[PDB]
Amino acid sequence: GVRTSPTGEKVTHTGQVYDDEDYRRVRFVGRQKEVNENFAIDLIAEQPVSQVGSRVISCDGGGGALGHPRVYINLDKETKTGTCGYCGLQFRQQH
Amino acid sequence: VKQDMPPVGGYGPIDYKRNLPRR
Amino acid sequence: TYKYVNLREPSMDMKSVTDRAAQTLLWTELIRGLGMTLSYLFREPATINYPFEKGPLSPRFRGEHALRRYPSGEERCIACKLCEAVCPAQAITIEAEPRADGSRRTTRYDIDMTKCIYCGFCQEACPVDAIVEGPNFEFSTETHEELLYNKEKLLNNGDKWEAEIAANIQADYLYR
Amino acid sequence: SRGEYVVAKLDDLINWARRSSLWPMTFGLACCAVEMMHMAAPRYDMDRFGVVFRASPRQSDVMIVAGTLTNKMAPALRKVYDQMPEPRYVVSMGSCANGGGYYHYSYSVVRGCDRIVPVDIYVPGCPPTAEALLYGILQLQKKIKREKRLRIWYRR
Amino acid sequence: TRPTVRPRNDVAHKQLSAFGEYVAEILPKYVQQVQVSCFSELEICIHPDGVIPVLTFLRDHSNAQFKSLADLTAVDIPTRQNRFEIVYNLLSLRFNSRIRVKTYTDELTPVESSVSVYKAANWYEREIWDMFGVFFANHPDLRRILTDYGFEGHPFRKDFPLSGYVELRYDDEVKRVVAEPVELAQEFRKFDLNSPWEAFPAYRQPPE
Amino acid sequence: LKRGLQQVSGHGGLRGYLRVLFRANDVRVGTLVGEDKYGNKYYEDNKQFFGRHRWVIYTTEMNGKNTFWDVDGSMVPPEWHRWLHCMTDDPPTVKPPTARKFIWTNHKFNLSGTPQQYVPYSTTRKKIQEWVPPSTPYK
Amino acid sequence: LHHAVIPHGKGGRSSVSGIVATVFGATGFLGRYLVNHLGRMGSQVIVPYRCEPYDTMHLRPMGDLGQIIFMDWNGRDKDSIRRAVEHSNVVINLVGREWETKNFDFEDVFVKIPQAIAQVSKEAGVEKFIHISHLNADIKSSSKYLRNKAVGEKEVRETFPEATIIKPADIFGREDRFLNYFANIRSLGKKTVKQPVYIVDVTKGIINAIKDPDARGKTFAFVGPNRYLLFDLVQYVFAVAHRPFLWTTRDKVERIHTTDRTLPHLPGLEDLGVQATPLELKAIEVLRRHRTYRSEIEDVQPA
Amino acid sequence: TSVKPIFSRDMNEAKRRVRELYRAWYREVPNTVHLFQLDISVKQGRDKVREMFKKNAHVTDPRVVDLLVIKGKMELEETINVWKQRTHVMRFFHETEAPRPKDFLSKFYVGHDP
Amino acid sequence: SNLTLNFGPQHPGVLRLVMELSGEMVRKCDPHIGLLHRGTEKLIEYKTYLQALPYFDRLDYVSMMCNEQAYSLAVEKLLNIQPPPRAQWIRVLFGEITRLLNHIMAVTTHALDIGAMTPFFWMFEEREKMFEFYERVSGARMHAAYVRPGGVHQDLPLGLMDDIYEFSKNFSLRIDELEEMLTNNRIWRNRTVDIGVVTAEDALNYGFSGVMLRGSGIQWDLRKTQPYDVYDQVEFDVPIGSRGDCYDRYLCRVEEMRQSIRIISQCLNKMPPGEIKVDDAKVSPPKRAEMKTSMESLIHHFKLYTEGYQVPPGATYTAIEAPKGEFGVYLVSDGSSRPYRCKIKAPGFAHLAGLDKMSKGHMLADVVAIIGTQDIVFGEVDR
Numbered sequence A: 001g002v003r004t005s006p007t008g009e010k011v012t013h014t015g016q017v018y019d020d021e022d023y024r025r026v027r028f029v030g031r032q033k034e035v036n037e038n039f040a041i042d043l044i045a046e047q048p049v050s051q052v053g054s055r056v057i058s059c060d061g062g063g064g065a066l067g068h069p070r071v072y073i074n075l076d077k078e079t080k081t082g083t084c085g086y087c088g089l090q091f092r093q094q095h
Numbered sequence B: 001v002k003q004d005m006p007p008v009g010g011y012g013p014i015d016y017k018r019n020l021p022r023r
Numbered sequence C: 001t002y003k004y005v006n007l008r009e010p011s012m013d014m015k016s017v018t019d020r021a022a023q024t025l026l027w028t029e030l031i032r033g034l035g036m037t038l039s040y041l042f043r044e045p046a047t048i049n050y051p052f053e054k055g056p057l058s059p060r061f062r063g064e065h066a067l068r069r070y071p072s073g074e075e076r077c078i079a080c081k082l083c084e085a086v087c088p089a090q091a092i093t094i095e096a097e098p099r100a101d102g103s104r105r106t107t108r109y110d111i112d113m114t115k116c117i118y119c120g121f122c123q124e125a126c127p128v129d130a131i132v133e134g135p136n137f138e139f140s141t142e143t144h145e146e147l148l149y150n151k152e153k154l155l156n157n158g159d160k161w162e163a164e165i166a167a168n169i170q171a172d173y174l175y176r
Numbered sequence D: 001s002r003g004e005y006v007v008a009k010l011d012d013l014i015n016w017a018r019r020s021s022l023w024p025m026t027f028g029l030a031c032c033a034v035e036m037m038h039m040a041a042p043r044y045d046m047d048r049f050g051v052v053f054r055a056s057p058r059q060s061d062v063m064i065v066a067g068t069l070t071n072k073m074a075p076a077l078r079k080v081y082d083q084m085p086e087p088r089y090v091v092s093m094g095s096c097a098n099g100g101g102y103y104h105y106s107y108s109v110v111r112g113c114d115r116i117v118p119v120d121i122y123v124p125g126c127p128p129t130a131e132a133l134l135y136g137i138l139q140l141q142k143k144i145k146r147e148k149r150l151r152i153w154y155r156r
Numbered sequence E: 001t002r003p004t005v006r007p008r009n010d011v012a013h014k015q016l017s018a019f020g021e022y023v024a025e026i027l028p029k030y031v032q033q034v035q036v037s038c039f040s041e042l043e044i045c046i047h048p049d050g051v052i053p054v055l056t057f058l059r060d061h062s063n064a065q066f067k068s069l070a071d072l073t074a075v076d077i078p079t080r081q082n083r084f085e086i087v088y089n090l091l092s093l094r095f096n097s098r099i100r101v102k103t104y105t106d107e108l109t110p111v112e113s114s115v116s117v118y119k120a121a122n123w124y125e126r127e128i129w130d131m132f133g134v135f136f137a138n139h140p141d142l143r144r145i146l147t148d149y150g151f152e153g154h155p156f157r158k159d160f161p162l163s164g165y166v167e168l169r170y171d172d173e174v175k176r177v178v179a180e181p182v183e184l185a186q187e188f189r190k191f192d193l194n195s196p197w198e199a200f201p202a203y204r205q206p207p208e
Numbered sequence F: 001l002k003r004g005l006q007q008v009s010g011h012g013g014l015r016g017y018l019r020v021l022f023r024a025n026d027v028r029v030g031t032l033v034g035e036d037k038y039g040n041k042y043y044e045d046n047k048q049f050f051g052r053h054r055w056v057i058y059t060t061e062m063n064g065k066n067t068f069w070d071v072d073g074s075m076v077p078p079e080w081h082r083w084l085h086c087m088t089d090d091p092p093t094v095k096p097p098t099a100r101k102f103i104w105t106n107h108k109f110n111l112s113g114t115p116q117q118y119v120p121y122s123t124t125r126k127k128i129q130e131w132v133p134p135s136t137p138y139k
Numbered sequence G: 001l002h003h004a005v006i007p008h009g010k011g012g013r014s015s016v017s018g019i020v021a022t023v024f025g026a027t028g029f030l031g032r033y034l035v036n037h038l039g040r041m042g043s044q045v046i047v048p049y050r051c052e053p054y055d056t057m058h059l060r061p062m063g064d065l066g067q068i069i070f071m072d073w074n075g076r077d078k079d080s081i082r083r084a085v086e087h088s089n090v091v092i093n094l095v096g097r098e099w100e101t102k103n104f105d106f107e108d109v110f111v112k113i114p115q116a117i118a119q120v121s122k123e124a125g126v127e128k129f130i131h132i133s134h135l136n137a138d139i140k141s142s143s144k145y146l147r148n149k150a151v152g153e154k155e156v157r158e159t160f161p162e163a164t165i166i167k168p169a170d171i172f173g174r175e176d177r178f179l180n181y182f183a184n185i186r187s188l189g190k191k192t193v194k195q196p197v198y199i200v201d202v203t204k205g206i207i208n209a210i211k212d213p214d215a216r217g218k219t220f221a222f223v224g225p226n227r228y229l230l231f232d233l234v235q236y237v238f239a240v241a242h243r244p245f246l247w248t249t250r251d252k253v254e255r256i257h258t259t260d261r262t263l264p265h266l267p268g269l270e271d272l273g274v275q276a277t278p279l280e281l282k283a284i285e286v287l288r289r290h291r292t293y294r295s296e297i298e299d300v301q302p303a
Numbered sequence H: 001t002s003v004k005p006i007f008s009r010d011m012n013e014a015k016r017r018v019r020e021l022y023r024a025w026y027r028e029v030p031n032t033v034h035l036f037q038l039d040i041s042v043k044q045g046r047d048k049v050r051e052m053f054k055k056n057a058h059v060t061d062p063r064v065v066d067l068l069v070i071k072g073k074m075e076l077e078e079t080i081n082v083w084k085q086r087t088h089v090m091r092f093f094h095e096t097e098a099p100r101p102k103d104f105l106s107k108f109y110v111g112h113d114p
Numbered sequence I: 001s002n003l004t005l006n007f008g009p010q011h012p013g014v015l016r017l018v019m020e021l022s023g024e025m026v027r028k029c030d031p032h033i034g035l036l037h038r039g040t041e042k043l044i045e046y047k048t049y050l051q052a053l054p055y056f057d058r059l060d061y062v063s064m065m066c067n068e069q070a071y072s073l074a075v076e077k078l079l080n081i082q083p084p085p086r087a088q089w090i091r092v093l094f095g096e097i098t099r100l101l102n103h104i105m106a107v108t109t110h111a112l113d114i115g116a117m118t119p120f121f122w123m124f125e126e127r128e129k130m131f132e133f134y135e136r137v138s139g140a141r142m143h144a145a146y147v148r149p150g151g152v153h154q155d156l157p158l159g160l161m162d163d164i165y166e167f168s169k170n171f172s173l174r175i176d177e178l179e180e181m182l183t184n185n186r187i188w189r190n191r192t193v194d195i196g197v198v199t200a201e202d203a204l205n206y207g208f209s210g211v212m213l214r215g216s217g218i219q220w221d222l223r224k225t226q227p228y229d230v231y232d233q234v235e236f237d238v239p240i241g242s243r244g245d246c247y248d249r250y251l252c253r254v255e256e257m258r259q260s261i262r263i264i265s266q267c268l269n270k271m272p273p274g275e276i277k278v279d280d281a282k283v284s285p286p287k288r289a290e291m292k293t294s295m296e297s298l299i300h301h302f303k304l305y306t307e308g309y310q311v312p313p314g315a316t317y318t319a320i321e322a323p324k325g326e327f328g329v330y331l332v333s334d335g336s337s338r339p340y341r342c343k344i345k346a347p348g349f350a351h352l353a354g355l356d357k358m359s360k361g362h363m364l365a366d367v368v369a370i371i372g373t374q375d376i377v378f379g380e381v382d383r
């Protein structure tokens, strides 16, 4: 689920793992580097690419006042799916 | 409709007098 | 409309002066105060047992804020810096980078719980409701190092519960 | 191992004896003092845990720093802290006390009460709930449970 | 204009206009600006040679009682020659009125020290001396209230920075609290929030 | 007066009534709402005043910490943390909401003064990328 | 050196100086003053302790937010010591109890402790290891203490050749051993030259030796500016303590009757460059606790 | 520029008031160093008092010298009273500076410092 | 000569007091205050309006909504906004609740500062229920900001006024039992009658405000003379003191608690269901549903929280009847998004100015009773 450097310490979702010439490896002695082991990139590549039969479609976020404000996105390119900046989940068109 | 909090037809009295039994 | 007090004269009627003398000699009202203290002695105590009965609260309680995330999705934050702009203690520290996907995101989202006055302005300033002041009071930290929450302590704290936070927001999203 | 058995149980006895009473003094400058007075309320007791308010510095086991620790106050703070016996334990209560807090970027405010006294238990909040302060005092008692003073004295 | 707009009254506005004109008629020597704002509170802007005559007139004279004294401050304004503005804020008892006597001064001028005609101005004057730096002559006691004794710099000025120059910490060398130059742990990010586009056209000063 | 026989004989008798007496303080058992994984039980009584509605009884061996004595807070899972602070009127056996597969199934409790606690660090990669000297020599 | 090891700006209190010091012992007297001067420098101090966390709690608020760090160690396992000096710029050896125990003696504390830590700090790959030893530590007799420290100096000179052996005299300070030991008494009258040196000059010498190279390898000696007699020292400290009066082991009394001598074959303070202070100022500082309420500066200065 | 004075008319009364205040600070030191239980001899205290008087030596305006006399008289009253503690009187000194040097070369080895 | 005692910051609030006393009956007392100095005015000068509202929430700390009400009415007076009526009535209800809270803490801490221990515990159980109300309303225990300039933010949830009604009945009985306990208690009357007399002429020259003016004669209520809100529609009366006693001032505080009970009763009975905040998106933030499904609401939310609303240039001084007295705020605002200089008139500061005339001819236990008998919190006295 997570990568780990050959120094033995876990990387994060941001690649900030320390080198061989630091002292923060010594500040982590005896106390665990509480890293979130749940990356945010790979939980979207597992999502189904939705296919909506219109041309320009809405995005709420699953609930009135529970979610991002409405974005209306366009689906006119043929090789690149439209992508909500808030959501991150894609759409396509069907005709 | 509206779902505020008004009282229900007006509440009862609340005493505001110094009460002593002088027994 | 004024209602002024401390206006009585000592009545030279025999009953009033002998009642004041009986008050002075026979210790009437001090035993009356003893009677009031005995009346609260024979009550039931209005205490709660702490480690078994945690006290009552409200569904909008403010404390131990953490980051939410989407239903079956990624992080909810945008690094739009509204919370850093509104934070009156100036405790928020945001550094933003986009990842390889192209969505704008972060690198660093650090909050000092020491500086945090716990207003609620970062709860209410967030447009997508990413940071929410949580339910509880569980800090009690031995070191000054550990009260400085990184993004990943915030995400573990937002993944230790969402059901609580989602229940409180679903209880109270029609007021704010 | 009979001597180590005796010394371990005696250490547990004296650590229970220390954590049993723990009657503090109340320093308490600003509104965190009012919240200490609200954990002196009947709904959150102190005499269930041996804790009795006592402003005598010479017989107070632990001390609760609470309120904005200013530069005019802090010499008087450590002047109180010195005349205090050989077990001394400090609870920093409130955002003003545990790292400066809301008055952090100002003159005449010490940036947290780590600059004057050592601090054992931080309890953040503004004000930290009397319920939360009571939780912090229980974790202070468990720090008293984990002292191992007499075991280290034996195996010195 | 009826909902959510504060309704102003014109009776108090006309009365405070008439009374400010009356005050400036009967005291011609010390009066420069007589202004009434939109929400009807009087302001009289004053040369610093008449603090005792204006306040002895205003505490008495039986047509304006003004027994009570409130805030005194001397708001620290740069860009001028005379920087400080001392604001005596007088409240009456028989009349329900509020006037602000605003006299001006620079950094090195004694104003006439109103402690003899308002006993409430004792700690107000001592506090303004300690915080701003305006000396008050013929005054019983000037000490430092609301500051440390070893601290100086008159900190409420705009010239004194937000964080001070000294910072205390305990050390075990000399076994006491010592003062060191400030080494902050975070920047105090100053934000550039003053956006353009002139949110009030009614307050446009005339250009050069 | 007569409850005290049936308060002992209903709680379990000589055995359990003394154990929960020496546990912390109180003996008000008798409502039996529901137990929970990590063993602990939740009892909501209705007759007592507001503050003594709902109590919890913790069990031993939840993370191998010998929690018979020195019981903390923070050992309760968050649905019962909503229920127990009086924010609702229904137990979480009715509707446990918003399952959300990323949610912890372990609930690692309050962990200060352990080998496993939080340390702060900069979640930020390389700043300015210092120069690298060439490997080859000259002459 | 990597970045975040370069210095930045002024000194102390989140002003990053460029050293990471692993400081052995450090719970007693001299280590606490040295951690005080390193927290004033604004460094990272790794203190290992084997005792209760209450004493490192008393020396805790010295450094800034997370500058100093605490870790456990022992005198038996090399793994905890290598974990202590995993990554460290410098390491200093300040250890030794003035009386025996049932678990550790004067034997093999000064032989088994510095060999193990010098071995694992050479193998971990650090530089500028500074070891303190007592003055006049010789193979010649009359102290188990001093012959063990002489064997320790020879062993730390043998292994890890680029070490800084530094040796102070009988240092005196606010919480001294020997001067407080003199004030807490009741005594004899003999003659013995002895030169105390004040502790803040010694630790300024140590921090200058720890951040000022060209002093690596060479052994240094601290000489106080006084060098006078013990009898007039005792009468001066009683006269400043306002009392006339005309663990106490045999090794301690033979240390305070050992004639401290100096050899100029190794350089002192001036080739390192910090001013020394005389007795009397700091003596009037430390000699409090006279009586209920209770100057005559003697200044013998023999030879 | 007919300016209102504070106390004086020219520099003559300024010199008279500052020598009066220096006489007071000279006779005020040994009482305080006996009282607050300091660690510094009387001669060093008097030398730093006259150093504090030699610090402001280039001041020429009479109102400014009058205001400095007022500052010194306020602090002398607060030190002849027992209001100020040991901390502030030791804060007048400088024992915990580790003072930064003034040569260009040692300002160059710890740089970015004009 | 005479005994110059130095009462330090130990508890008999927190101060330092140097008293050159004669012989168990004093001569010259000087309060050295300023030990709790924080720098509120400089911090508000370097911050915005909405961000520096909690400084006005906590410069006084026992009163927690009247100080918010004073600063919010300063900004609403300068900015020309009348708040909606339901916001005004909730503001009045919480002003009366905070008034009840501050008077009952002043009574109990004066009783404990003399030395009586138990009504402290009783009325702090009552104030625990007060804080339960504050928790249910805002979410904070004590420091609820909650009062925006532009009306009450985020109105009270459904199911509160019945609890306030129950609390009104039970609290009337509990204050009647406090008068049953104390008040004709003989040793307490012996403790405080003839100490700290104040002439009304000196009450006006020394600038006393609020309860001191009620005790020393002259009838002066801001709520009756200058109605700054809907106080003109609720009917109540103010208590006046005949003699200048401390016992008289105690009676005045108890009767102000009782009149706060009356105003809470009428405010519950006459609540209009108008609206939460103002009808202007440029001052109050828009609600979250319109924010999400509206463009202009998102733009006004974003700019109103980053830059804040601007304020027209000008200076104002408003003051409201806080339980300590005329709590005053004097704003000076250059036309910008930050205030230029704010300053606070503290009734505790004005009362502590007259400590010499209140403790000239009495002993030192009476000095402690005088320091207690004025609701002085030593955080508001600092400014």
Ligand SMILES: NC(=O)C1=CN([C@@H]2O[C@H](COP(=O)(O)OP(=O)(O)OC[C@H]3O[C@@H](n4cnc5c(N)ncnc54)[C@H](OP(=O)(O)O)[C@@H]3O)[C@@H](O)[C@H]2O)C=CC1
Residues within 6 Å of the ligand: G024, G025, G026, G027, G028, G029, G030, G031, G049, G050, G051, G075, G094, G095, G096, G097, G098, G104, G109, G132, G133, G134, G135, G168, G169, G170, G171, G177, G178
């Ligand atoms: N007269 C003097 O003071 C002089 C002293 N020195 C040297 O200074 C050093 C420190 O002396 P000082 O502070 O006065 O006395 P201490 O004995 O108190 O200091 C030694 C430190 O090392 C620790 N220590 C000692 N033995 C052991 C052990 N076996 N295992 C683990 N830790 C140990 C001590 O206790 P703990 O285990 O609790 O940490 C303490 O922290 C010594 O090495 C001494 O040779 C040199 C010249 C003069």
Ligand code: SF4
Residues within 6 Å of the ligand: C076, C077, C078, C079, C080, C081, C082, C083, C084, C094, C125, C126, C127, C128, C129, C130, C131
């Ligand atoms: S306001 Fe919300 S979306 Fe914006 S930076 Fe803060 S947490 Fe992220």
Ligand code: SF4
Residues within 6 Å of the ligand: C086, C087, C088, C089, C090, C091, C092, C111, C115, C116, C117, C118, C119, C120, C121, C122, C123
């Ligand atoms: S609640 Fe805390 S983090 Fe949020 S805006 Fe306030 S001080 Fe900042």
Ligand code: SF4
Residues within 6 Å of the ligand: D030, D031, D032, D066, D067, D068, D093, D094, D095, D096, D097, D101, D102, D125, D126, D127, D128, I058
């Ligand atoms: S932390 Fe908050 S509650 Fe405590 S003193 Fe500071 S402002 Fe008051």
Ligand SMILES: [Zn+2]
Residues within 6 Å of the ligand: A059, A060, A061, A068, A071, A084, A085, A086, A087, A088
């Ligand atoms: Zn979307």
